[PDB]
Amino acid sequence: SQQFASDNYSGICPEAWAAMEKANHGHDRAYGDDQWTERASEYFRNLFETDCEVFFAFNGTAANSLALASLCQSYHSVICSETAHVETDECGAPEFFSNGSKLLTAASVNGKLTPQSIREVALKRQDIHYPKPRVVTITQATEVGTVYRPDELKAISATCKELGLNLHMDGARFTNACAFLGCSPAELTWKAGVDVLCFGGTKNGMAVGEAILFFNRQLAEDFDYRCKQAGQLASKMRFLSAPWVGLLEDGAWLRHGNHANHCAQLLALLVSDLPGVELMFPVEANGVFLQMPEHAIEALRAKGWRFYTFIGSGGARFMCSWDTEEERVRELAADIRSIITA
Amino acid sequence: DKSQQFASDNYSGICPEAWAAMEKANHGHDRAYGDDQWTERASEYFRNLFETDCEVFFAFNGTAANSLALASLCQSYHSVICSETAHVETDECGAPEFFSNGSKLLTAASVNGKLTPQSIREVALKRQDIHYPKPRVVTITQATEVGTVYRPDELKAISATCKELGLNLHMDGARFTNACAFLGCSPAELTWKAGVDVLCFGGTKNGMAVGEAILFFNRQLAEDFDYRCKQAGQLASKMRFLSAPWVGLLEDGAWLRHGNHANHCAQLLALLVSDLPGVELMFPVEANGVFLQMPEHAIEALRAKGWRFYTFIGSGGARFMCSWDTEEERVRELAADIRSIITA
Amino acid sequence: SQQFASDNYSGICPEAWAAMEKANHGHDRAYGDDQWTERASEYFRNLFETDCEVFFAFNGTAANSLALASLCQSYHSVICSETAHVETDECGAPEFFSNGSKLLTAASVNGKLTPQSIREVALKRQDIHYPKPRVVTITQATEVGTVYRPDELKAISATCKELGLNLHMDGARFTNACAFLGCSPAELTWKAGVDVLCFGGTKNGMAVGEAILFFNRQLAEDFDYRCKQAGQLASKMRFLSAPWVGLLEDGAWLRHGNHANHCAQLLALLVSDLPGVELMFPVEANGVFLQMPEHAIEALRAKGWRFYTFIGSGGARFMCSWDTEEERVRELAADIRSIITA
Amino acid sequence: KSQQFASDNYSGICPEAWAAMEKANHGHDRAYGDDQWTERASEYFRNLFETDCEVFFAFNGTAANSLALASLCQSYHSVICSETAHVETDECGAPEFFSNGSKLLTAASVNGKLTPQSIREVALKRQDIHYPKPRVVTITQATEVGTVYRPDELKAISATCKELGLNLHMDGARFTNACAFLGCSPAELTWKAGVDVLCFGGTKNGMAVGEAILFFNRQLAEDFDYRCKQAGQLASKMRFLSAPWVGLLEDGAWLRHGNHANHCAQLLALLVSDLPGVELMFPVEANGVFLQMPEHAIEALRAKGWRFYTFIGSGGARFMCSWDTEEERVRELAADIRSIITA
Ligand SMILES: Cc1ncc(COP(=O)(O)O)c(C)c1O
Ligand SMILES: Cc1ncc(COP(=O)(O)O)c(C)c1O
Ligand SMILES: Cc1ncc(COP(=O)(O)O)c(C)c1O
Ligand SMILES: Cc1ncc(COP(=O)(O)O)c(C)c1O
């Protein structure tokens, strides 16, 4: 019995595990200076069609927090959404890594920032009493399962230029957004004005690690020193970089993302039209956000269905992963149908 | 006439009591960093004034004083609960987060510039999971940034909640004087008798050149605070010039005379104008500021001899602020021009 | 093949690979709340013979830096040796993690602090101009391959208690110290007064991760929040904790350490009676420190041997790992004889 | 008779500072630097240093140096200082707090002074990611042991800093004493010799509170006002930090107070360095006299009513003269040294 709590509970996929076994034969130089790390970096430059600089941190909390700290001073501020992971789920790590850059929440719409909600935040305060906004962060796919599209990104970068702002992307679930859309990685990042991407691996079948991709190379000066000082330098770096070889060499990363997307779409197809069940947001990645009644405690007691419930408390989230079985999706949907109609 | 506007009580000068104390203190050589007669003398007056054995420190300004006090009350992986209009949130260029190394400021709902036990509980109970920094402090401002005052009963309620939730309670008393004068309470009744643990007591705004007193009523919380301040660049070499002015202000009641004056000036203005049509007082005048909804005639009062004052990022709302040295006649001139303008 | 630069270049030992394989069957709850993490902590508790609090971080730099930041405030100081890793190899990580606690170097005989060298540094500075010392960190085995003995530790501990200092152990090479002396782990830590131990895993055959053991559970208050904010919290904690189960269940940790020690003791035995070659320190762990003449170049770059050279001209350090073959040792000692004799 | 030789930090507010504060206390004026006194001070600083330097005020020298160093490199970079540097010995770890972890690396010093060689020693042995990369050099002028960098010593440090990509900061807590002694222009002791940033002490030379921070390289001062604000170092009532500089700078008073304090230290040392068992530990190039003495110094200390800073214990004794030091009291102190040792 697997569950729908989160894609952090999934295991290592076979291509990641296979890269790791290959990387475990021999001795190799530490701290980045190895063949596996240069191969993964080469793959990243080709995938994104650019000479991006590539770094590897241990988890997404540190990767986001480092990236942002490199994009502005402690006396500047960072514009994010209200559901942003850097605002809700990192126990104040950005502020620790930045030595006090304020996160200013902007209004959002479908989990997404807009040009107007940014400007409303930035321009309310170019006075020294306020840390001057200098960075926008967006999550792709968002924390509520939605996806910024290329033109929405460009509109946001446009505001970032009117206002002086760098643009960071938390791509913890970037794959899900690439699977969903036709796009190439480049059209979803630097072609649309993205300065830096944090590209999640852990959630897409890896044991540990995130990649950080600087598309403006002037912003990446000495980033390796920052990472070391912040305790984010793997000595046995191949075991962070090798799985990215596995996942990128013939498109497995994007297959695993389509799978997880298809499971969540299937779940929503099966349940979103029942009575008393409202889809909170369109299913554009691997999550399903349902308003339901006291049937959550029934779906919860009635078999250990494991899933997250909001403090909104008339609301539940189901997350699908690369290793989710369609049959389990149908079984979950069936139990939801039973519990509502009966 | 005249240099004196209605923009900020931070444009006022050094009052005579503060100046006279600095001059006396400028007679001889004394030892540094707190080990002088003036600093001990000032601490005595604070203990006497607050009726308790509070520990006393001096910093250079309110931003550091608040930022130091809050950092001493919880870890970087804990959070601070404040109002949406708290100076620590709006006016300190992120100093609290710098001084604490990353304590998140969590804003709670405000009724009349004030937090309630309810708004504190709501923020606090949503964040027991490790994804959020755990709340460990509530900060309140007295008088508040919209010129309202918390009453001892309002404070006791907050203090109970903080004690139920394991929260320390910090008071930003940049305008503490204005709240004591208005209510007529004792300082002790507006701080530790209602459960305040640490008070930042502003001097600058009420007639000093520089300097803010930090008072720890809960002395477990003050261990090594002097090292914290030193490392933070907040230790005066010539400490007598921070502490002597508090002897000036406290020996004979001048601090409250100056606060009552600024309050009475603010109250006058509101009396003179709050009955005119198209002029709403947004908040009771419980300290030294006046908050008026008016029409686009802000430019009218603004252009008219360049009354200087603050507008909000809001269209038709203005803030007039009085200090220890505001002349009542300037207030009368201002209220007059406000009336002329609205009746024309 | 394999070199003598650092025990950081070695791979994942078999007991640890196996544990990760078993831990990769199924889904598990995140951020520490899994059976592997509980099992690992139980092994530590039995192994050290005490109810110690157990945490996992990603590497030794963060682990040390985290433990030390938890033992004193930013306006306090830490007493460490001049060769301490926290002073030389961490790109200022301790100061970053502690928000500015000063590291005060005390004098070392044989890579080791003494009660006297601690006292000198601590009493010199009881005035506010100086951050007040509040922690002693020692390294076990030390950075020069020596080992503190239970009696030396107890002595250092008596000083710490008298001066109100906490005692931290950087045990990046703790296995080597235990293998060598034959003591119980308890006898080299809490029975001798150690408050906190950073227990190296990466160096003894893991891909990633260190264990942090608090022997005073009150000092561990909220360490989990500290680690989370610092970006040191694994989402898939089982892949940091299961390898510890593998290394500890049947005694592999200590076997792997005796191996690395024996190879290093062999290398020194083979070359010690040579004329131009002097052993700078007793071989008490897995490193050999040799003063020989700048004909280290004929060993080095020349025949392709890899090893670190001390900032002393012709100061070479040779490091043996869990997977060092005795034949490569006998080879290295043979080439050293050719270059010296002829 | 409260007049001692422990520290020029115990001195009072001088008349030119006091009179300037008095003039500034007439009216209302806008806060946080937007002020007639702050602009006048800045113009005096620019004329005095013969250049278009950007001017800031902070509350004290610990913060002034810590802020200046923090703007000159990143937390994962390092600062090269001397073994006697105030930032290393006297600031309770403030540099590291303000920079969020920049390592202070000490370099070998002779007579309180860094040299191009000792800087180079440190900077070139710290070249891989294990070590925070050096990015700044700080020097103190006058130094912590009462000596002075000569313009030519400063040019040579600057040349080494330019070659190594290092910025150059100057802790001028006692800058007045160095200018008074050497007869150089301020420009010749700062930016003509390569200095990027000066912290110019006012408190030690007759003010109540405050330091000036001068950026000669204007690019390095970007957003420095925001850094100061976040660090708790922005005066609401800025006129009371900047007006005393108007008083000190408008007609020479700063140097006159520096020469007085140096001449008083020169007299003290003149009158006693010929006694036996009494030795000057360093040249008297500012307002300090460092004397190696006999433990019986305790009788100068003792019940003689003399305060001064005993070294580690008991060898050294350090004496410091101030703008308000009385020559007579110097002659007294030297006479009481004279007796005690003449028996
Ligand atoms: C949207 C988002 N960003 C970043 C992270 C950080 O992920 P982690 O620290 O578990 O690798 C998560 C969990 C996430 O959901
Ligand atoms: C409510 C409140 N708290 C603190 C401060 C900080 O004062 P300062 O300008 O002296 O840093 C102010 C201005 C304030 O209005
Ligand atoms: C003695 C010592 N302690 C701690 C560490 C930190 O190890 P890591 O390289 O895994 O950050 C090392 C490398 C070390 O040699
Ligand atoms: C050489 C030096 N630099 C900086 C300072 C800091 O001065 P303050 O005590 O005003 O913080 C002092 C006292 C000093 O002697």
PDB file of C-alpha atoms in Angstrom, chain D residues 160-291:
ATOM      1  CA  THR D 160      50.688  44.891  -2.908  1.00  0.00           C
ATOM      2  CA  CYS D 161      46.904  45.224  -2.431  1.00  0.00           C
ATOM      3  CA  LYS D 162      46.406  46.261  -6.070  1.00  0.00           C
ATOM      4  CA  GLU D 163      48.530  43.376  -7.265  1.00  0.00           C
ATOM      5  CA  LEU D 164      46.644  40.867  -5.152  1.00  0.00           C
ATOM      6  CA  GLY D 165      43.122  42.249  -5.915  1.00  0.00           C
ATOM      7  CA  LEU D 166      42.677  43.459  -2.310  1.00  0.00           C
ATOM      8  CA  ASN D 167      40.783  46.529  -1.061  1.00  0.00           C
ATOM      9  CA  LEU D 168      42.445  48.716   1.583  1.00  0.00           C
ATOM     10  CA  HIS D 169      40.661  49.898   4.695  1.00  0.00           C
ATOM     11  CA  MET D 170      42.048  52.311   7.279  1.00  0.00           C
ATOM     12  CA  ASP D 171      40.945  52.332  10.882  1.00  0.00           C
ATOM     13  CA  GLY D 172      41.590  56.002  11.677  1.00  0.00           C
ATOM     14  CA  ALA D 173      40.361  55.947  15.229  1.00  0.00           C
ATOM     15  CA  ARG D 174      43.524  58.005  15.942  1.00  0.00           C
ATOM     16  CA  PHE D 175      43.926  59.435  12.443  1.00  0.00           C
ATOM     17  CA  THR D 176      44.324  62.990  13.836  1.00  0.00           C
ATOM     18  CA  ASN D 177      47.410  61.990  15.834  1.00  0.00           C
ATOM     19  CA  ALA D 178      49.058  60.543  12.734  1.00  0.00           C
ATOM     20  CA  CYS D 179      48.354  63.669  10.667  1.00  0.00           C
ATOM     21  CA  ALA D 180      49.577  65.916  13.490  1.00  0.00           C
ATOM     22  CA  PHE D 181      52.877  64.099  13.895  1.00  0.00           C
ATOM     23  CA  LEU D 182      53.725  63.676  10.195  1.00  0.00           C
ATOM     24  CA  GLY D 183      52.792  67.063   8.825  1.00  0.00           C
ATOM     25  CA  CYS D 184      51.166  65.368   5.750  1.00  0.00           C
ATOM     26  CA  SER D 185      47.889  66.368   4.235  1.00  0.00           C
ATOM     27  CA  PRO D 186      44.983  64.029   4.954  1.00  0.00           C
ATOM     28  CA  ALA D 187      44.933  63.163   1.207  1.00  0.00           C
ATOM     29  CA  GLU D 188      48.562  62.060   1.346  1.00  0.00           C
ATOM     30  CA  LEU D 189      47.799  59.656   4.194  1.00  0.00           C
ATOM     31  CA  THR D 190      44.699  58.157   2.538  1.00  0.00           C
ATOM     32  CA  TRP D 191      43.693  58.081  -1.105  1.00  0.00           C
ATOM     33  CA  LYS D 192      46.936  59.373  -2.639  1.00  0.00           C
ATOM     34  CA  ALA D 193      48.564  56.418  -0.880  1.00  0.00           C
ATOM     35  CA  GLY D 194      45.904  53.899  -2.059  1.00  0.00           C
ATOM     36  CA  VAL D 195      43.302  53.860   0.771  1.00  0.00           C
ATOM     37  CA  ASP D 196      39.756  52.952  -0.411  1.00  0.00           C
ATOM     38  CA  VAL D 197      37.951  53.675   2.864  1.00  0.00           C
ATOM     39  CA  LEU D 198      38.784  55.621   6.046  1.00  0.00           C
ATOM     40  CA  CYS D 199      37.082  55.360   9.410  1.00  0.00           C
ATOM     41  CA  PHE D 200      37.833  58.728  10.949  1.00  0.00           C
ATOM     42  CA  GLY D 201      37.476  58.759  14.729  1.00  0.00           C
ATOM     43  CA  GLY D 202      35.763  61.763  16.280  1.00  0.00           C
ATOM     44  CA  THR D 203      34.924  60.410  19.732  1.00  0.00           C
ATOM     45  CA  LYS D 204      38.555  59.987  20.818  1.00  0.00           C
ATOM     46  CA  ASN D 205      39.446  63.549  19.758  1.00  0.00           C
ATOM     47  CA  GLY D 206      36.781  65.491  21.652  1.00  0.00           C
ATOM     48  CA  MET D 207      33.262  64.372  20.645  1.00  0.00           C
ATOM     49  CA  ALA D 208      30.459  62.718  22.556  1.00  0.00           C
ATOM     50  CA  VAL D 209      29.502  60.089  20.008  1.00  0.00           C
ATOM     51  CA  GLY D 210      30.052  59.197  16.375  1.00  0.00           C
ATOM     52  CA  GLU D 211      32.611  58.301  13.687  1.00  0.00           C
ATOM     53  CA  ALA D 212      32.863  59.426  10.093  1.00  0.00           C
ATOM     54  CA  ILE D 213      33.255  56.871   7.267  1.00  0.00           C
ATOM     55  CA  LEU D 214      34.812  58.185   4.069  1.00  0.00           C
ATOM     56  CA  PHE D 215      34.755  56.272   0.811  1.00  0.00           C
ATOM     57  CA  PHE D 216      37.432  57.506  -1.600  1.00  0.00           C
ATOM     58  CA  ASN D 217      36.453  54.851  -4.062  1.00  0.00           C
ATOM     59  CA  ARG D 218      32.816  55.884  -4.640  1.00  0.00           C
ATOM     60  CA  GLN D 219      31.806  52.604  -6.285  1.00  0.00           C
ATOM     61  CA  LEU D 220      32.502  50.774  -3.007  1.00  0.00           C
ATOM     62  CA  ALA D 221      29.896  52.935  -1.173  1.00  0.00           C
ATOM     63  CA  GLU D 222      26.904  51.634  -3.133  1.00  0.00           C
ATOM     64  CA  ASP D 223      23.855  51.252  -0.833  1.00  0.00           C
ATOM     65  CA  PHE D 224      26.093  51.824   2.177  1.00  0.00           C
ATOM     66  CA  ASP D 225      23.293  53.880   3.703  1.00  0.00           C
ATOM     67  CA  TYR D 226      21.010  50.795   3.609  1.00  0.00           C
ATOM     68  CA  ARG D 227      23.693  48.654   5.247  1.00  0.00           C
ATOM     69  CA  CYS D 228      23.995  51.211   8.058  1.00  0.00           C
ATOM     70  CA  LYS D 229      20.210  51.403   8.478  1.00  0.00           C
ATOM     71  CA  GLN D 230      19.789  47.638   8.717  1.00  0.00           C
ATOM     72  CA  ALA D 231      22.721  47.437  11.115  1.00  0.00           C
ATOM     73  CA  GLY D 232      21.155  49.821  13.583  1.00  0.00           C
ATOM     74  CA  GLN D 233      23.660  52.603  12.834  1.00  0.00           C
ATOM     75  CA  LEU D 234      21.544  55.400  11.356  1.00  0.00           C
ATOM     76  CA  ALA D 235      21.021  58.439  13.546  1.00  0.00           C
ATOM     77  CA  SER D 236      17.527  59.903  13.549  1.00  0.00           C
ATOM     78  CA  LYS D 237      19.052  63.202  14.677  1.00  0.00           C
ATOM     79  CA  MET D 238      22.052  63.124  12.404  1.00  0.00           C
ATOM     80  CA  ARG D 239      22.937  66.831  12.994  1.00  0.00           C
ATOM     81  CA  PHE D 240      24.258  65.921  16.429  1.00  0.00           C
ATOM     82  CA  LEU D 241      26.784  63.532  14.868  1.00  0.00           C
ATOM     83  CA  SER D 242      27.749  65.753  11.936  1.00  0.00           C
ATOM     84  CA  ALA D 243      27.767  69.256  13.483  1.00  0.00           C
ATOM     85  CA  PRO D 244      30.699  68.477  15.816  1.00  0.00           C
ATOM     86  CA  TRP D 245      32.705  67.757  12.675  1.00  0.00           C
ATOM     87  CA  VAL D 246      31.885  71.242  11.386  1.00  0.00           C
ATOM     88  CA  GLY D 247      33.284  72.621  14.630  1.00  0.00           C
ATOM     89  CA  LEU D 248      36.330  70.385  14.485  1.00  0.00           C
ATOM     90  CA  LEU D 249      37.162  71.048  10.840  1.00  0.00           C
ATOM     91  CA  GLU D 250      36.216  74.645  10.022  1.00  0.00           C
ATOM     92  CA  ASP D 251      39.508  76.146  11.261  1.00  0.00           C
ATOM     93  CA  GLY D 252      42.045  73.532  12.335  1.00  0.00           C
ATOM     94  CA  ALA D 253      40.773  72.539  15.774  1.00  0.00           C
ATOM     95  CA  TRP D 254      41.002  68.803  15.060  1.00  0.00           C
ATOM     96  CA  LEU D 255      44.765  68.989  14.363  1.00  0.00           C
ATOM     97  CA  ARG D 256      45.356  71.356  17.270  1.00  0.00           C
ATOM     98  CA  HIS D 257      43.835  68.826  19.629  1.00  0.00           C
ATOM     99  CA  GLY D 258      45.887  66.059  18.021  1.00  0.00           C
ATOM    100  CA  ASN D 259      49.168  67.985  18.308  1.00  0.00           C
ATOM    101  CA  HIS D 260      48.429  68.813  21.942  1.00  0.00           C
ATOM    102  CA  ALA D 261      47.890  65.165  22.842  1.00  0.00           C
ATOM    103  CA  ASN D 262      51.012  64.078  20.926  1.00  0.00           C
ATOM    104  CA  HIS D 263      53.185  66.787  22.514  1.00  0.00           C
ATOM    105  CA  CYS D 264      51.946  65.729  25.970  1.00  0.00           C
ATOM    106  CA  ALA D 265      52.957  62.167  25.242  1.00  0.00           C
ATOM    107  CA  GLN D 266      56.269  63.366  23.869  1.00  0.00           C
ATOM    108  CA  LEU D 267      56.919  65.266  27.106  1.00  0.00           C
ATOM    109  CA  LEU D 268      56.036  62.313  29.338  1.00  0.00           C
ATOM    110  CA  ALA D 269      58.459  60.106  27.427  1.00  0.00           C
ATOM    111  CA  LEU D 270      61.074  62.832  27.234  1.00  0.00           C
ATOM    112  CA  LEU D 271      61.081  63.184  31.012  1.00  0.00           C
ATOM    113  CA  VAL D 272      61.468  59.495  31.854  1.00  0.00           C
ATOM    114  CA  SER D 273      63.000  57.379  29.120  1.00  0.00           C
ATOM    115  CA  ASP D 274      66.491  58.059  30.485  1.00  0.00           C
ATOM    116  CA  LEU D 275      65.746  56.438  33.829  1.00  0.00           C
ATOM    117  CA  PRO D 276      67.235  52.968  34.401  1.00  0.00           C
ATOM    118  CA  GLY D 277      65.002  49.938  34.155  1.00  0.00           C
ATOM    119  CA  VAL D 278      62.501  52.075  32.219  1.00  0.00           C
ATOM    120  CA  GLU D 279      62.244  51.527  28.453  1.00  0.00           C
ATOM    121  CA  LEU D 280      59.992  52.816  25.655  1.00  0.00           C
ATOM    122  CA  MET D 281      58.548  49.728  24.004  1.00  0.00           C
ATOM    123  CA  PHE D 282      57.735  51.628  20.775  1.00  0.00           C
ATOM    124  CA  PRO D 283      58.432  55.029  19.200  1.00  0.00           C
ATOM    125  CA  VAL D 284      56.215  57.858  20.395  1.00  0.00           C
ATOM    126  CA  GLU D 285      54.512  58.788  17.135  1.00  0.00           C
ATOM    127  CA  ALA D 286      51.084  59.642  18.485  1.00  0.00           C
ATOM    128  CA  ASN D 287      49.507  60.170  21.901  1.00  0.00           C
ATOM    129  CA  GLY D 288      50.634  56.997  23.678  1.00  0.00           C
ATOM    130  CA  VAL D 289      53.698  56.137  25.748  1.00  0.00           C
ATOM    131  CA  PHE D 290      54.426  52.409  26.211  1.00  0.00           C
ATOM    132  CA  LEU D 291      56.891  51.788  29.096  1.00  0.00           C
TER     133      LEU D 291
END
